[PDB]
Paper text:
Cry78Aa is a novel protein identified from the Bt C9F1 strain that effectively kills rice planthoppers, with median lethal concentration (LC50) values against Laodelphax striatellus and Nilaparvata lugens of 6.89 and 15.78 μg ml−1, respectively. Here, we report the crystal structure of Cry78Aa, which consists of two domains: a C-terminal β-pore forming domain belonging to the aerolysin family and an N-terminal trefoil domain resembling the S-type ricin B lectin. We also found that Cry78Aa binds carbohydrates such as galactose derivatives and is essential for insecticidal activity against Laodelphax striatellus.
Here, we resolved the crystal structure of Cry78Aa13-359, which approximately resembles full-length Cry78Aa. Consequently, the structure of Cry78Aa13-359 was resolved by combining SAD with molecular replacement using Cry78Aa155-359 as a model. The final structure of Cry78Aa13-359 was refined to 2.9 Å resolution with Rwork and Rfree values of 0.279 and 0.282, respectively. Taking one protomer (Mol A) as an example, monomeric Cry78Aa13-359 exhibits a rigid rod-like shape and comprises two domains, the NTD and the CTD. The NTD of Cry78Aa13-359 has a typical trefoil shape which is usually composed of three sets of β-sheets and is also known as the trefoil domain. The CTD of Cry78Aa13-359 is mainly composed of several long parallel β-sheets and three α-helices, and is regarded as a β-pore-forming domain. The NTD of Cry78Aa13-359 glues four protein molecules together.
Numbering used by the authors:
A (entry chain B): 17 to 357
B (entry chain C): 16 to 355
C (entry chain D): 17 to 355
D (entry chain A): 17 to 356
Write the structure that this text describes.
Amino acid sequence: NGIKALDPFNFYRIRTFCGKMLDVVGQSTSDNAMVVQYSINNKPNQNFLVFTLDDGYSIIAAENSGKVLDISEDFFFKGMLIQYHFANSDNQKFLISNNGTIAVKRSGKVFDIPGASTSNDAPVIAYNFNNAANQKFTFERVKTFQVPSPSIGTLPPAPDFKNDINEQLPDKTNPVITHFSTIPYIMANDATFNSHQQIQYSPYYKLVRIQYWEKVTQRILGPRDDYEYNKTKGISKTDQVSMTETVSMSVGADFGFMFKGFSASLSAQITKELSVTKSTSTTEMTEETYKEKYTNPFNYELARAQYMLVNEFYVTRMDGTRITANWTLRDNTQTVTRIFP
Amino acid sequence: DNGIKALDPFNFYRIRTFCGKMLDVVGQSTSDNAMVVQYSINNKPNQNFLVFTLDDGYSIIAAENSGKVLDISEDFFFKGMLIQYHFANSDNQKFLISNNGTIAVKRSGKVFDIPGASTSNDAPVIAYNFNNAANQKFTFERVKTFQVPSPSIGTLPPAPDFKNDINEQLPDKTNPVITHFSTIPYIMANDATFNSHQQIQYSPYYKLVRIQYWEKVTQRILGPRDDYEYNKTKGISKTDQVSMTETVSMSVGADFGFMFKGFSASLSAQITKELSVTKSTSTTEMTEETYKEKYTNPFNYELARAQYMLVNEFYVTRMDGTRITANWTLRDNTQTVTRI
Amino acid sequence: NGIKALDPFNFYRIRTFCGKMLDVVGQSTSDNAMVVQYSINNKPNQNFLVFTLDDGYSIIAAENSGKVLDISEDFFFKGMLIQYHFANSDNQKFLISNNGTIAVKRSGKVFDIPGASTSNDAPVIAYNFNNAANQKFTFERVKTFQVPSPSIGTLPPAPDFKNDINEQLPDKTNPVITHFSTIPYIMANDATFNSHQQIQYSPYYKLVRIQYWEKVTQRILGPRDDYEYNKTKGISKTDQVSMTETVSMSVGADFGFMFKGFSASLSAQITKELSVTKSTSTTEMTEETYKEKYTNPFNYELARAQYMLVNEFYVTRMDGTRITANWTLRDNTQTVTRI
Amino acid sequence: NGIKALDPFNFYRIRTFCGKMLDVVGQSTSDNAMVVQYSINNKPNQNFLVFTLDDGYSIIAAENSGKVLDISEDFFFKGMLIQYHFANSDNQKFLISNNGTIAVKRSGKVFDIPGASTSNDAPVIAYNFNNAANQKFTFERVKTFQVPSPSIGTLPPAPDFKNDINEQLPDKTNPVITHFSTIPYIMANDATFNSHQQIQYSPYYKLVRIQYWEKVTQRILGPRDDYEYNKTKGISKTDQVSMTETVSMSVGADFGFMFKGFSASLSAQITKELSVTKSTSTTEMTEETYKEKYTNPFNYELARAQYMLVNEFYVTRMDGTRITANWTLRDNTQTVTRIF
Ligand SMILES: [N+]
Ligand SMILES: [N+]
Ligand SMILES: [N+]
Ligand SMILES: [N+]
C-alpha cells in the first residue's frame, strides 16, 4: 500500500469505521475547536479539501472556515484533533495512504477513534498504528468545482527588420500567457478575502506568467559612430516585497525563484508548472539600470534594435480576479539583437 | 432536582456512568494527557475519587491516582472538557452532586455528559446543558474506607490560685490541654514535605488543633506602698501570622477573629464552628507587642499578686498526627485572671 | 422544494443519505418482503421504475419482480417499507420532491432510515418529516430503454362518387392509426405475462386508436322510392368486457371512456393522448342495430352512400406484440352522406 | 457452550454488541410491535424477565406490556422480533447460552442485529448462527424483587382418644401450609389483572398446598353393632374446572396432576415444589360420595373415629392476595382409623 491520490478540486467527506463523518463543529463541541465524528449532516462542517504537498504529506482544510486540521501538542490535551488556522506545522501535515490510515508528520501516530466509539461526538486522538479498523478512514467525493484555465500561447520571436532601414520596430511584442501555477488558498494572502471567504470562493489561486520581448534601444548611426544607451535588468524591490507578502516568494540573483515559509512545500510543483528554476543564490535580485555603449563595426550606415525578454508574474483568484499588480522581471541573459542586412 | 446527595467524607468513591463504566483519570488513548474518560472497571486508583463538600454545598472531587482534582476547561480550544488539574479555588472545579444523579458545574450550570451516549472505553466527559438524559446521570460507589484519629479533648482548667502561702511560687503555665480541633481536606493545607499526590495517598484530611492554657504574666510580693514595672505581652507574632497564612491561608485579625484567605474561605463556617472561633471583621492583622505595666499595692497589709493570661496555640498535623508546623501562639489580653 | 421530474423510460437506483441503495432482497431479509438499505450490488433488486400519475404522485416498481413499494398498515409492523403487488392504494403512492424526500400519500410521513443506520440491512420506516439527512434520497439513472412508436396517419375524408359513374364505393377506408397512449404494465392485465415478466420485457403497454369510415349503405333508386336499410352503432358487450378485463376501461353511452379501478389514476393522461372524452354517462354503451328509411326526394334516379366513423382500440406490448383483438366502437354521431 | 443461568426474580437488561439495549417501543417504531436496538433509557421499555422452563428453553417477558418476545412467521415479515401476547409457541421459547447467543426453539437461527447496525431502532432478525459479534447479547441485572414465602409446617398426626370413650375428637386438624410452588404470571389466568398489570405487581404467582385430617365418622358401638355412614373421596367438578381455567391443571384419577397447555413445561418444577405425582391417568378424577358400613366385631363397647387426608390447592398473587377458592382434594388412600 502507498500514498492515496485524490483529485484536488473535489470537496471530501471523511468516513470513519462506523459510517459517521468527521465534523469540525459537533453538538456538545459546538463551542470549541474539537473535531469529532458525527452523523451525516450534508453541511460544510463535514466537507474538506485535501492539498497534497511535494513531500507527499497533505493539508486537510475544512469548508466551514479557512482553518485546517491540527493535532494539539498541548500538555493538558496532547494528541487531540482540533481545528486551527494553517501554520505550516508538522502536526498539520498528514499522510493519507491506500490502507486507509491518516498519519501525522510530526509523530508516527495515526488518526484513531478512542475506544472505537460509535457515538456522534466521539473525538479523534493520535495513537500508535495497530491496524485496527477504527484507525482507518475513507474519503468520499461530495461536490466538485472547476478552476478556469487562462488561454496559453507560446512566446513569439523578437521582431526583425523587413527591408526598410528606417522602419521602427515595435517597442514590445504582444504579451502572452505562457505558464500558470495552481496553488491552494492557504499559500496566497488575499487582503480582501479572509481565510473562510477564500475557501468558499477561491479555493485555489493562480500564479500566471506572461512573456514578451521589450525593445531596449533602436538607433541608426554612421559607419564608424558610437552611442551610449541605458539598459535595465532585474526586478524592483516593490515587486520583490509584494511577491513575498502575497505568496512568500522572491527572485534570487541567479534568476531563480526563492521559496520562503509555506511556499517551500510546493517548490517542485511551482517550478515545474511555471518552467522556472529554483534559486541557488543567497541574495535577492534588484532592479539595475546601467549604461551600455555600442560602436558600428560596418562601414555602411547601419540600424540596430535590441530586444530583452521580460517576465510579468501575478496572482489571481480562482475566477480570475487579479489581486496584485504584475511583478516585472527583466532577464538580461535572454536577449535578441537585430540589425539591417 | 430531588436535592443534594450526601456522601461520607472518609470514603473513596467510584463514579459509575450510565453504561456501567467508571470515570478514569488516565485512560488508554488519553494516558499522556489530563483528560478524564469513562473506562471499564480496573479497580485501580485512577478510577478512585474522594469528595470534599464545601460550605456552599458544592463539592470538590479529587483523584486518588494524583493529588489533582476534576476540572472543566475554559480554554478557547477545549472548552467544557473534563480534566484533572491542580486544585484552585475556582467555580469550574466546584460541582453539585444531586440525588437525581446529575453532577452540575457551578460556573456554568451545565452538567456532566457522555458525548453521544458513548459506551466506549475512552469516552470523554463534556459539560452539557441539562436535558435529563440517562448519560447525564452518575452513581457513586464506595470503594474503600479510612478513619481520621481524633485528639483527646479536655476542658480549660481554672487559673492557678494561692493556697494560704504568700511566698508560694505559682506555676508559670498550666498543663496545655487540647480543647478543639478542625478536620480539613488536604487541598486546604500546604505541606512542605508531602506533595499533593502523597497527600491524597497518606493524609487526605489534615487537622487544625487548638490548645488553651493559662500563662503567668507576673508574680510579686511587695510592701504597703511599693512600685514596680513589669512586661506584659499580647497578640500573635508576625512569624506565626506568616506561617499560618503560608500553611492554611489563614491569619488572625486585630479583633481576635480569624481572617480566611484564598482556599480557606470555602470552609470558613466549618472551621470557625469546629474551633469555636469568630470570623474577623477587621481589615488589619494582629501583631504581638510587649508593653510595660506599673503596679502599686492599695492595701496596708502585705499581699502577693499573680496574674495569668489565657494563651491559645494553633497547629496543623497530618491524619496520623504528624506535626508539620510549630504551634502558632495567640495571647488573649482580654481573658486574664488576677490572684491575691 | 417542488415536484421532481424523472424520465419514464429509465430504470433508477435509489441512493440513500450514506451512499447505499434500497434493495428489495437484502441479506437477513432475503426470505421476506422487507426492503432495506444495502450496499451497491448492481443487480435488478436495486433497480426501480417510477410511474407518475395524474395526481402528481408516483408508483415505484422494483425490477426483481412485478411488485411495487408498499408501506404496511399492519397493526404489528405499521410503517415498514415492503415489496407488495400493485393495488392502487394510497400507501403505494409516493410524492418525490426536489428537497429529496419521498412522501407517503396516505399519511404525511416520509421515507426514513431509522437511527440514520449505515448498515447493510437497515430497514425503511415512514416517519414524520424533520428535514434530517436520513429522510433524503436521490434517484440515479441506471439503464434506459426505448418504446417503439407506431406509424401515425390522419383520417382520410370519406370517399365520394367520381363522374357520377354510379360505381360501387369502398366498404371501408384504409384504417389509420390516429392516436396511441403509453401506459405502465401495472395498469394492463396480460394473460400471457405475469407481473415479473411484464416489467422485464414490456414495462409500458400501448393502447392504440384506429379510425376509418365504414359504408353503412349504398343504393341507387328511382324518383320517390323508399327503402329500409340496417345501421349499427355502439360497441359490443364482448369488447366492453374485454376492455374492462384488460385495462379496466369501458365505453359509456355518451361515447366517452369510463375509467374504472386502476385506470382512473391516468384518466387525464390517457384522454389527452387519445384525444377522447371522459365519460359522463351512468350506463355503459351497447351495440345496437336498427333500420333507417330513406325516400328519394329528387325527381330522378339518385345514388346515395353513407359512411360512419369507426374506432378500433387495442392493446399491445412494448415491442408491439398485440395481446387483444380490436375493440370496435361505431360513432353514430360522426357520419357523412354523399350523393 | 452451555445454558446460561439467570436468577428468576431479577428484571434484566439485554445488551447488544455495541452497548445499546433492546427496547420494545423504540422511536420510529413507537407505533408498532417491533423490538429494536436503542440506547439506554433506564425505563421499563428495556426491562425483561426470563422464565426458564424444564426443557431449558426460556420465555422473555417485557415489563412495559406483559407481552413476550416473538419471532414472526408472517410471510412478509418472517424472522422479525416483536412483542406478542404469550402463547405456548416454540417461536416464543428461546435458548440463552453462555456464549451470548439467543436461539429460537422453533428454528435453529438465533438473534442477530442486521448489518451489525450500531444505530437506534435497529431491528432484530433471526439469522443462521455464524458466531459474529452482532449475534451475542449480555443480560444485566436492573432491579430485583422478592417473593414472600408462607410459613411451612409438617402434617400433624390424626387425633387419638385420650382415655375417654365418650370424648368427641375434632372434626378436622388445624390446617397447615405444607407446600407452595412459584410460577410465572404467564401461567396464571387472573380475571382482575391483565398481562401488563400482572408483570408490574405479581411477576410470579404462588400455588399453595394445605393438608389436614378430616373426620369421616365417629361412633360408639355395643357388641355386634353396625351402622352405615357416608364417605366422600376425590375432587369436585367445579374445582377441576377452576383449576384448569386458572393454571391449566387438573387432578387425574390416580391422584396425580394433569398438566395442560403451558403448565406441562413446568411439570418437573411444580411436582417437586408441591411434592405431588405427575398423573399417568387418562381420565380426570371426580368427587364421589358413598355409604360404607362398619360392624363392631368385639363385645367391648368401643369408639371408632376415622380421619381422611384432605388437600386444598389455591393460587395467590406474589403479595399473597388470593385469586381463587381452595380446590379440595380428598385422598381416601391416606386414612387413619382410631379405636379405644
Ligand atoms: N443548537
Ligand atoms: N495501560
Ligand atoms: N443483496
Ligand atoms: N424510547
